[PDB]
Amino acid sequence: MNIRPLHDRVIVKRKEVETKSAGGIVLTGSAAAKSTRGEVLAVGNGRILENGEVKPLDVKVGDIVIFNDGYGVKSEKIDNEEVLIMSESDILAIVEA
Amino acid sequence: MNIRPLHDRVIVKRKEVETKSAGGIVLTGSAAAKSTRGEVLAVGNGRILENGEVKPLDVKVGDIVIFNDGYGVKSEKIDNEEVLIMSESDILAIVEA
Amino acid sequence: MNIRPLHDRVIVKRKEVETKSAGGIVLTGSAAAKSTRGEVLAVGNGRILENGEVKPLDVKVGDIVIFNDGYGVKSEKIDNEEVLIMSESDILAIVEA
Amino acid sequence: MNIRPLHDRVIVKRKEVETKSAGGIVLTGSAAAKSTRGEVLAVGNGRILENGEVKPLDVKVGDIVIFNDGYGVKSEKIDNEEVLIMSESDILAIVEA
């Protein structure tokens, strides 16, 4: 629990910080690599744009993710877990290929 | 009482300033932590965008909140209580998970 | 009298400058407090946006007000009275709670 | 005569420069007061916005005016008379109260 997910928004974990076997081999020092990958934890359900019936959000909760880090992405520690709140449109892929 | 809530706006308290048991344990000094969480005190009733019948606001008064602090958020001490006035759209969640 | 109110605009007095009993108690020096509160003196009647019949303005003349001070708000001394000219949309509340 | 008024534009004189009896009493030095008041000398007839039949302009020629001085307002000495060319929408009132 937070309070409601917001309309047209998504809540994700960031997938990892440092996949620490770089190339599968070397143990990297400070890459400082914040993965653009993520995991969807919640969805905003609908978009009410254009004064029309709530357009369904593009996909659904419980898939992993690939997002564009941006001003729209917001860092919130909901409960004890760091989670990121953005519009569903700030995402750049899931899994396509 | 103020004077009317504005159309498409919301009035919230900020939920807290400093949840003072950090981690549940340490008594924090100056975190200066202004909670992005809030509590809805009033709602603007409708959005008249797109020259259409007043779209109902997304949720309703008397739930807690999670908002994006922004230029749109305005600090007003209505009566003796500090309250924040913004569009309903400036909110980033209630409670979604 | 000015010359017509403009379309979609409002004319307000600013409610006060310095409510001089701060907390009801202390007589404040220079707070320099320009009240964001106001009183509606005139209304623009209608909004012609979206090529549609003049949408009625959200409320009506002769209520007090709460406005966002902004570039859109314009200070004009109509007659001998300082009045503020803005769009009806630059207001942030009347009275909601 | 100029050449046509432009579509959605208005032509106004500025009402005065310095109403020189300040308060009705003192003879002001350099206030440098360019009156935001004006007098409508011409109207653009219609607005063709939204791909719809020419919306009539909000009022009509031969009333005085109150305008927002702005980049859109353009100073042109048509003939021997200084006149100001702007969109009808750059006006902030005629006469409303």
Added chain:
Amino acid sequence: VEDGTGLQDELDVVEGMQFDRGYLSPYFINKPETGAVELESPFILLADKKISNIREMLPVLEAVAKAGKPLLIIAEDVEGEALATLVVNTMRGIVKVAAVKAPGFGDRRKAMLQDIATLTGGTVISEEIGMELEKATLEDLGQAKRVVINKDTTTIIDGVGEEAAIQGRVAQIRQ
């Protein structure tokens, strides 16, 4: 005592409160042969701070123009914003005014201005002592008989101030 080039000694006794400051504008002179501005029955503003906004001071000024007694402005820093506007009013006979720079500098000038206020039955009118300057009423100013101002000289004849208040301030100064 001062050097006097006349070979005979001469004594001059100044009468009343005189501060060594002069008219800000030569245009202020209302008596050209004298070369001095004589205001008969003046009100006196003893102002705080730097004031180059006639822009703000106006409603006080309007009240004086209606009243029709001349006025003196004592103040710290003054533009042509005031002086040309004052020339526009004075030299074309709308209002009757003259203006001088406040004596010396610093808190010593402030302590001195209070002495003038007590003498003139007037007030040190000041933001920093709690008045918006533009809120002042005609009774909030001082008054006196008659003033004369040169390019070096300011003289003030016989104040409205309460005699026991003046004697009190003289005694308070004596402490």
Added chain:
Amino acid sequence: VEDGTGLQDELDVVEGMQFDRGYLSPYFINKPETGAVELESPFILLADKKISNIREMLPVLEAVAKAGKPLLIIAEDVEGEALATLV
């Protein structure tokens, strides 16, 4: 011992805690003939830091105004923001 211009020696004993600092505003004086501010029964604020926000300090100040005992402010740096408001 200090130089005294009176040709006879004089001894002065200060009583209690005295620090050599003076009223920020001449307007504060409540006893003009004395030339000194006498506060009978004062509360005392011993403040940290530089404080030119009456703006923030207000609810404490309101409580004192209701209480009606005089107050002394000891503090490091003070604008007219306080002093004119105090006057």
